[PDB]
Design a protein around this motif. Structure first.
Motif, mmCIF file in Angstrom:
data_model
loop_
_atom_site.group_PDB
_atom_site.id
_atom_site.type_symbol
_atom_site.label_atom_id
_atom_site.label_comp_id
_atom_site.label_asym_id
_atom_site.label_seq_id
_atom_site.Cartn_x
_atom_site.Cartn_y
_atom_site.Cartn_z
ATOM 1 N N UNK A 183 -51.385 48.827 48.680
ATOM 2 C CA UNK A 183 -52.356 47.749 48.730
ATOM 3 C C UNK A 183 -51.612 46.472 49.125
ATOM 4 N N UNK A 184 -51.802 46.072 50.386
ATOM 5 C CA UNK A 184 -51.402 44.766 50.879
ATOM 6 C C UNK A 184 -52.491 43.805 50.435
ATOM 7 N N UNK A 185 -52.226 43.135 49.312
ATOM 8 C CA UNK A 185 -53.157 42.184 48.726
ATOM 9 C C UNK A 185 -52.587 40.785 48.937
ATOM 10 N N UNK A 186 -53.459 39.807 49.205
ATOM 11 C CA UNK A 186 -53.030 38.431 49.405
ATOM 12 C C UNK A 186 -54.236 37.507 49.236
ATOM 13 N N UNK A 187 -53.954 36.199 49.104
ATOM 14 C CA UNK A 187 -54.936 35.136 48.996
ATOM 15 C C UNK A 187 -55.006 34.353 50.310
ATOM 16 N N UNK A 188 -56.215 33.941 50.721
ATOM 17 C CA UNK A 188 -56.341 32.979 51.801
ATOM 18 C C UNK A 188 -57.578 32.120 51.588
ATOM 19 N N UNK A 189 -57.462 30.828 51.891
ATOM 20 C CA UNK A 189 -58.596 29.930 52.046
ATOM 21 C C UNK A 189 -59.696 30.594 52.869
ATOM 22 N N UNK A 190 -60.951 30.415 52.447
ATOM 23 C CA UNK A 190 -62.068 30.820 53.290
ATOM 24 C C UNK A 190 -63.127 29.721 53.261
ATOM 25 N N UNK A 191 -64.157 29.761 54.135
ATOM 26 C CA UNK A 191 -65.263 28.807 54.036
ATOM 27 C C UNK A 191 -65.894 28.713 52.645
ATOM 28 N N UNK A 192 -65.762 29.765 51.823
ATOM 29 C CA UNK A 192 -66.291 29.717 50.456
ATOM 30 C C UNK A 192 -65.201 29.367 49.437
ATOM 31 N N UNK A 193 -64.026 28.925 49.903
ATOM 32 C CA UNK A 193 -62.895 28.677 49.020
ATOM 33 C C UNK A 193 -61.977 29.897 48.921
ATOM 34 N N UNK A 194 -60.874 29.759 48.172
ATOM 35 C CA UNK A 194 -59.866 30.801 48.109
ATOM 36 C C UNK A 194 -60.505 32.140 47.754
#
Ligand SMILES: [Co+2]
Length: 323
Positions: free
Chosen positions: A73-84
Protein backbone atom coordinates in the motif's frame (compact mmCIF):
# COMPACT_ATOMS: atom_id res chain seq x y z
CA UNK A 1 24.26 -2.39 -18.20
CA UNK A 2 21.84 -2.79 -21.15
CA UNK A 3 19.05 -4.77 -19.38
CA UNK A 4 16.79 -1.65 -19.72
CA UNK A 5 16.83 -2.08 -23.53
CA UNK A 6 15.78 -5.72 -23.25
CA UNK A 7 12.09 -4.70 -23.55
CA UNK A 8 12.93 -3.21 -26.95
CA UNK A 9 13.78 -6.72 -28.20
CA UNK A 10 11.31 -8.78 -26.20
CA UNK A 11 9.17 -11.14 -28.30
CA UNK A 12 6.03 -13.13 -27.38
CA UNK A 13 6.12 -16.89 -27.17
CA UNK A 14 2.90 -17.44 -29.16
CA UNK A 15 0.33 -20.02 -28.05
CA UNK A 16 -0.98 -22.69 -30.43
CA UNK A 17 -4.65 -23.54 -30.91
CA UNK A 18 -5.02 -26.11 -28.14
CA UNK A 19 -3.31 -23.64 -25.75
CA UNK A 20 -5.71 -20.86 -26.79
CA UNK A 21 -8.62 -23.28 -26.19
CA UNK A 22 -7.41 -24.06 -22.66
CA UNK A 23 -7.07 -20.38 -21.83
CA UNK A 24 -10.55 -19.63 -23.16
CA UNK A 25 -11.83 -22.48 -20.98
CA UNK A 26 -9.89 -21.38 -17.89
CA UNK A 27 -11.67 -18.08 -17.42
CA UNK A 28 -15.15 -17.72 -15.85
CA UNK A 29 -17.10 -14.57 -16.57
CA UNK A 30 -19.71 -15.64 -14.00
CA UNK A 31 -17.24 -16.27 -11.18
CA UNK A 32 -15.63 -12.88 -11.82
CA UNK A 33 -18.96 -11.07 -11.86
CA UNK A 34 -19.90 -12.38 -8.43
CA UNK A 35 -16.58 -12.67 -6.52
CA UNK A 36 -14.49 -9.99 -8.27
CA UNK A 37 -16.83 -7.41 -9.74
CA UNK A 38 -20.04 -7.19 -7.74
CA UNK A 39 -18.22 -6.19 -4.47
CA UNK A 40 -16.64 -3.20 -6.21
CA UNK A 41 -19.96 -1.78 -7.33
CA UNK A 42 -20.20 0.67 -4.45
CA UNK A 43 -19.21 4.30 -3.89
CA UNK A 44 -15.41 4.18 -3.38
CA UNK A 45 -14.02 7.72 -3.65
CA UNK A 46 -11.02 8.69 -1.42
CA UNK A 47 -11.70 8.49 2.32
CA UNK A 48 -15.06 6.81 1.74
CA UNK A 49 -15.97 3.52 3.50
CA UNK A 50 -16.07 2.15 -0.03
CA UNK A 51 -12.48 3.18 -0.57
CA UNK A 52 -11.51 0.99 2.43
CA UNK A 53 -13.64 -1.98 1.39
CA UNK A 54 -12.42 -1.71 -2.19
CA UNK A 55 -8.81 -1.98 -0.95
CA UNK A 56 -9.71 -4.81 1.46
CA UNK A 57 -11.49 -6.64 -1.35
CA UNK A 58 -8.52 -6.36 -3.73
CA UNK A 59 -5.85 -7.44 -1.23
CA UNK A 60 -7.93 -10.42 -0.11
CA UNK A 61 -8.63 -11.64 -3.64
CA UNK A 62 -4.92 -11.63 -4.49
CA UNK A 63 -4.01 -13.21 -1.14
CA UNK A 64 -6.09 -16.38 -1.55
CA UNK A 65 -4.06 -17.28 -4.64
CA UNK A 66 -0.98 -19.57 -4.63
CA UNK A 67 1.30 -17.37 -6.73
CA UNK A 68 3.81 -15.48 -4.62
CA UNK A 69 2.07 -12.13 -4.83
CA UNK A 70 3.79 -9.42 -2.79
CA UNK A 71 1.49 -6.52 -1.84
CA UNK A 72 2.27 -2.89 -0.93
CA UNK A 73 0.00 0.00 0.00
CA UNK A 74 1.57 3.20 -1.32
CA UNK A 75 -0.35 5.53 0.97
CA UNK A 76 0.19 9.30 1.09
CA UNK A 77 -1.49 12.66 1.81
CA UNK A 78 -2.17 15.43 -0.71
CA UNK A 79 -4.09 18.71 -0.72
CA UNK A 80 -7.33 18.46 -2.70
CA UNK A 81 -10.16 20.92 -3.56
CA UNK A 82 -11.91 19.50 -0.46
CA UNK A 83 -8.78 19.87 1.71
CA UNK A 84 -6.15 17.29 2.68
CA UNK A 85 -7.04 13.71 1.76
CA UNK A 86 -5.38 10.31 2.10
CA UNK A 87 -4.65 8.20 -0.99
CA UNK A 88 -3.52 4.53 -1.22
CA UNK A 89 -2.27 2.82 -4.38
CA UNK A 90 -2.39 -0.99 -4.25
CA UNK A 91 0.64 -2.67 -5.85
CA UNK A 92 0.70 -6.42 -6.34
CA UNK A 93 4.08 -7.78 -7.53
CA UNK A 94 5.39 -11.22 -8.41
CA UNK A 95 9.19 -11.54 -8.14
CA UNK A 96 9.69 -7.97 -6.77
CA UNK A 97 13.45 -7.98 -7.36
CA UNK A 98 13.19 -9.09 -11.01
CA UNK A 99 14.72 -6.25 -13.04
CA UNK A 100 11.79 -6.33 -15.49
CA UNK A 101 7.98 -6.30 -15.14
CA UNK A 102 5.01 -6.18 -17.45
CA UNK A 103 2.52 -3.92 -15.64
CA UNK A 104 -1.29 -4.15 -15.80
CA UNK A 105 -3.02 -1.17 -14.19
CA UNK A 106 -6.29 0.54 -13.56
CA UNK A 107 -7.93 2.87 -11.03
CA UNK A 108 -10.14 1.48 -8.24
CA UNK A 109 -11.38 4.85 -6.98
CA UNK A 110 -14.79 5.98 -8.27
CA UNK A 111 -15.55 9.63 -9.10
CA UNK A 112 -17.47 11.73 -6.56
CA UNK A 113 -21.08 12.60 -7.42
CA UNK A 114 -23.87 13.78 -5.14
CA UNK A 115 -26.95 11.63 -5.05
CA UNK A 116 -32.08 8.52 -5.27
CA UNK A 117 -29.12 7.24 -7.28
CA UNK A 118 -25.40 6.79 -6.61
CA UNK A 119 -22.39 6.72 -8.97
CA UNK A 120 -20.49 3.42 -8.94
CA UNK A 121 -18.46 3.67 -12.21
CA UNK A 122 -19.00 0.06 -13.44
CA UNK A 123 -16.96 0.47 -16.62
CA UNK A 124 -15.02 3.26 -14.88
CA UNK A 125 -13.23 1.26 -13.51
CA UNK A 126 -14.72 -1.52 -11.43
CA UNK A 127 -14.71 -3.80 -14.45
CA UNK A 128 -10.98 -3.19 -15.20
CA UNK A 129 -10.37 -4.10 -11.55
CA UNK A 130 -12.32 -7.35 -11.71
CA UNK A 131 -10.58 -8.24 -14.98
CA UNK A 132 -7.14 -7.88 -13.39
CA UNK A 133 -8.33 -9.99 -10.44
CA UNK A 134 -9.86 -12.59 -12.75
CA UNK A 135 -6.54 -12.67 -14.63
CA UNK A 136 -4.57 -13.12 -11.38
CA UNK A 137 -6.91 -16.05 -10.59
CA UNK A 138 -7.40 -17.59 -14.03
CA UNK A 139 -3.61 -17.84 -14.56
CA UNK A 140 -2.66 -18.79 -10.99
CA UNK A 141 -1.06 -22.20 -11.68
CA UNK A 142 0.90 -20.84 -14.67
CA UNK A 143 1.91 -17.63 -12.80
CA UNK A 144 2.98 -19.82 -9.85
CA UNK A 145 5.79 -21.32 -11.93
CA UNK A 146 7.35 -17.83 -12.00
CA UNK A 147 8.43 -18.78 -8.46
CA UNK A 148 10.80 -21.50 -9.74
CA UNK A 149 17.06 -19.64 -16.95
CA UNK A 150 15.12 -17.04 -19.01
CA UNK A 151 14.59 -13.20 -19.17
CA UNK A 152 14.56 -11.53 -15.78
CA UNK A 153 10.85 -10.69 -16.14
CA UNK A 154 7.67 -11.11 -14.03
CA UNK A 155 4.16 -9.62 -13.57
CA UNK A 156 3.03 -6.56 -11.68
CA UNK A 157 -0.56 -5.30 -11.10
CA UNK A 158 -1.36 -1.72 -10.04
CA UNK A 159 -4.66 -0.38 -8.75
CA UNK A 160 -4.38 3.43 -8.68
CA UNK A 161 -6.29 5.64 -6.25
CA UNK A 162 -7.27 9.27 -6.81
CA UNK A 163 -7.43 8.98 -10.61
CA UNK A 164 -10.66 10.99 -10.84
CA UNK A 165 -10.96 14.73 -10.21
CA UNK A 166 -12.91 16.07 -7.21
CA UNK A 167 -14.15 19.19 -9.00
CA UNK A 168 -13.31 20.12 -12.61
CA UNK A 169 -10.44 18.09 -14.15
CA UNK A 170 -7.05 19.81 -14.03
CA UNK A 171 -3.33 18.87 -13.75
CA UNK A 172 -3.47 19.36 -9.95
CA UNK A 173 -6.94 17.86 -9.42
CA UNK A 174 -6.60 14.35 -10.93
CA UNK A 175 -4.16 11.46 -11.27
CA UNK A 176 -3.25 11.79 -7.56
CA UNK A 177 -2.28 8.11 -7.28
CA UNK A 178 -0.40 7.79 -10.58
CA UNK A 179 1.40 11.15 -10.22
CA UNK A 180 2.60 10.13 -6.73
CA UNK A 181 3.70 6.59 -7.57
CA UNK A 182 5.40 7.40 -10.88
CA UNK A 183 7.45 10.07 -9.05
CA UNK A 184 8.25 7.53 -6.34
CA UNK A 185 9.29 4.86 -8.87
CA UNK A 186 11.38 7.49 -10.70
CA UNK A 187 13.65 8.02 -7.70
CA UNK A 188 13.71 4.46 -6.40
CA UNK A 189 16.79 2.41 -7.48
CA UNK A 190 16.05 -0.88 -9.25
CA UNK A 191 17.36 -3.46 -8.89
CA UNK A 192 18.22 -2.68 -5.23
CA UNK A 193 21.68 -1.12 -5.10
CA UNK A 194 21.92 -0.20 -8.79
CA UNK A 195 23.45 3.00 -10.17
CA UNK A 196 21.56 5.03 -12.74
CA UNK A 197 18.55 2.68 -13.08
CA UNK A 198 15.15 3.32 -11.43
CA UNK A 199 12.00 1.21 -11.04
CA UNK A 200 10.68 2.99 -14.12
CA UNK A 201 13.46 1.39 -16.20
CA UNK A 202 12.08 -1.93 -14.91
CA UNK A 203 8.62 -1.26 -16.38
CA UNK A 204 8.65 -3.18 -19.68
CA UNK A 205 5.15 -2.03 -20.71
CA UNK A 206 2.40 -0.27 -18.77
CA UNK A 207 -0.88 -1.87 -19.86
CA UNK A 208 -3.57 0.49 -18.53
CA UNK A 209 -7.18 -0.75 -18.59
CA UNK A 210 -9.89 1.91 -18.46
CA UNK A 211 -13.59 2.42 -19.27
CA UNK A 212 -14.11 -1.22 -20.13
CA UNK A 213 -17.55 -2.78 -19.98
CA UNK A 214 -19.75 -1.14 -22.68
CA UNK A 215 -21.04 -3.05 -25.79
CA UNK A 216 -18.92 -2.90 -28.99
CA UNK A 217 -15.89 -1.00 -27.60
CA UNK A 218 -13.33 0.21 -30.11
CA UNK A 219 -9.71 0.72 -29.01
CA UNK A 220 -7.41 2.75 -31.28
CA UNK A 221 -3.71 1.98 -31.38
CA UNK A 222 -2.53 5.13 -29.66
CA UNK A 223 1.27 4.91 -29.49
CA UNK A 224 3.98 3.89 -32.06
CA UNK A 225 6.37 2.60 -29.38
CA UNK A 226 3.69 0.11 -28.24
CA UNK A 227 2.00 -0.42 -31.62
CA UNK A 228 3.71 -3.82 -32.09
CA UNK A 229 2.08 -4.97 -28.83
CA UNK A 230 -1.29 -3.53 -29.89
CA UNK A 231 -0.97 -5.70 -33.04
CA UNK A 232 -0.59 -8.69 -30.76
CA UNK A 233 -3.96 -7.91 -29.18
CA UNK A 234 -5.49 -7.63 -32.66
CA UNK A 235 -3.92 -10.94 -33.65
CA UNK A 236 -5.09 -12.64 -30.49
CA UNK A 237 -8.60 -11.18 -30.97
CA UNK A 238 -8.59 -12.51 -34.55
CA UNK A 239 -7.33 -16.01 -33.75
CA UNK A 240 -9.72 -16.46 -30.79
CA UNK A 241 -12.63 -15.46 -33.05
CA UNK A 242 -11.60 -17.87 -35.83
CA UNK A 243 -11.28 -20.69 -33.34
CA UNK A 244 -14.86 -20.16 -32.07
CA UNK A 245 -13.76 -19.18 -28.55
CA UNK A 246 -15.34 -15.74 -28.45
CA UNK A 247 -19.04 -15.06 -27.80
CA UNK A 248 -21.26 -12.68 -29.83
CA UNK A 249 -18.15 -11.54 -31.72
CA UNK A 250 -17.91 -10.57 -35.37
CA UNK A 251 -14.76 -9.46 -37.19
CA UNK A 252 -16.81 -6.44 -38.30
CA UNK A 253 -17.45 -5.42 -34.68
CA UNK A 254 -13.86 -6.15 -33.52
CA UNK A 255 -12.38 -4.22 -30.63
CA UNK A 256 -8.79 -3.41 -31.57
CA UNK A 257 -8.55 -1.04 -34.51
CA UNK A 258 -5.96 -0.20 -37.18
CA UNK A 259 -6.26 3.52 -36.64
CA UNK A 260 -4.96 5.87 -33.97
CA UNK A 261 -6.36 8.92 -32.20
CA UNK A 262 -6.09 12.66 -32.78
CA UNK A 263 -6.10 14.30 -29.33
CA UNK A 264 -4.28 13.41 -26.10
CA UNK A 265 -6.15 11.40 -23.43
CA UNK A 266 -5.21 12.30 -19.85
CA UNK A 267 -5.22 9.17 -17.61
CA UNK A 268 -2.97 7.33 -15.11
CA UNK A 269 -0.40 6.49 -17.82
CA UNK A 270 0.43 10.16 -18.30
CA UNK A 271 3.04 10.47 -15.46
CA UNK A 272 4.65 7.24 -16.70
CA UNK A 273 4.62 8.10 -20.44
CA UNK A 274 6.20 11.54 -19.88
CA UNK A 275 9.16 9.80 -18.17
CA UNK A 276 9.47 7.38 -21.07
CA UNK A 277 7.59 4.22 -20.10
CA UNK A 278 6.01 2.29 -23.04
CA UNK A 279 2.19 2.56 -22.63
CA UNK A 280 -0.42 0.26 -24.13
CA UNK A 281 -3.53 2.30 -23.32
CA UNK A 282 -6.60 0.07 -23.35
CA UNK A 283 -9.21 2.82 -23.13
CA UNK A 284 -11.87 2.97 -25.95
CA UNK A 285 -12.51 5.85 -28.39
CA UNK A 286 -15.25 6.75 -28.08
CA UNK A 287 -15.80 6.38 -24.33
CA UNK A 288 -18.91 4.36 -23.29
CA UNK A 289 -22.10 6.42 -23.71
CA UNK A 290 -22.63 6.08 -19.94
CA UNK A 291 -19.41 8.00 -19.27
CA UNK A 292 -19.72 9.94 -15.99
CA UNK A 293 -23.40 9.11 -15.80
CA UNK A 294 -25.58 7.37 -13.17
CA UNK A 295 -26.13 4.72 -15.87
CA UNK A 296 -22.46 3.77 -15.57
CA UNK A 297 -23.74 0.70 -13.81
CA UNK A 298 -24.16 -3.04 -14.02
CA UNK A 299 -27.34 -3.42 -16.08
CA UNK A 300 -25.45 -1.50 -18.76
CA UNK A 301 -22.38 -3.78 -18.73
CA UNK A 302 -22.09 -6.46 -21.44
CA UNK A 303 -20.97 -9.79 -19.97
CA UNK A 304 -19.82 -11.18 -23.31
CA UNK A 305 -17.54 -8.24 -24.26
CA UNK A 306 -15.87 -8.53 -20.83
CA UNK A 307 -15.46 -12.30 -21.17
CA UNK A 308 -14.05 -11.84 -24.72
CA UNK A 309 -11.64 -9.15 -23.44
CA UNK A 310 -10.64 -11.34 -20.47
CA UNK A 311 -9.62 -14.14 -22.89
CA UNK A 312 -7.64 -11.78 -25.14
CA UNK A 313 -5.82 -10.14 -22.18
CA UNK A 314 -4.99 -13.44 -20.47
CA UNK A 315 -3.51 -14.81 -23.73
CA UNK A 316 -1.58 -11.61 -24.25
CA UNK A 317 -0.14 -11.82 -20.73
CA UNK A 318 0.87 -15.50 -21.01
CA UNK A 319 2.65 -14.83 -24.31
CA UNK A 320 4.37 -11.73 -23.05
CA UNK A 321 5.69 -13.61 -19.99
CA UNK A 322 6.31 -16.74 -22.07
CA UNK A 323 4.01 -18.90 -19.91
CO1 LIG B 1 -14.14 8.56 -14.71
Amino acid sequence: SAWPEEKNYHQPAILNSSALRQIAEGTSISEMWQNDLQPLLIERYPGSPGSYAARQHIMQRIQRLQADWVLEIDTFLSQTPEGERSFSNIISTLNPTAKRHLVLACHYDSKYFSHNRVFVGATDSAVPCAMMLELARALDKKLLSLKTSKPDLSLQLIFFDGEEAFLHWSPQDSLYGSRHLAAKMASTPHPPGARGTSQLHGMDLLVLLDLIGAPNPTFPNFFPNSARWFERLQAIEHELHELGLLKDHSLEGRYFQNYSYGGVIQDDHIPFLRRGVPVLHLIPSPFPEVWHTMDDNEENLDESTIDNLNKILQVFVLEYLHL
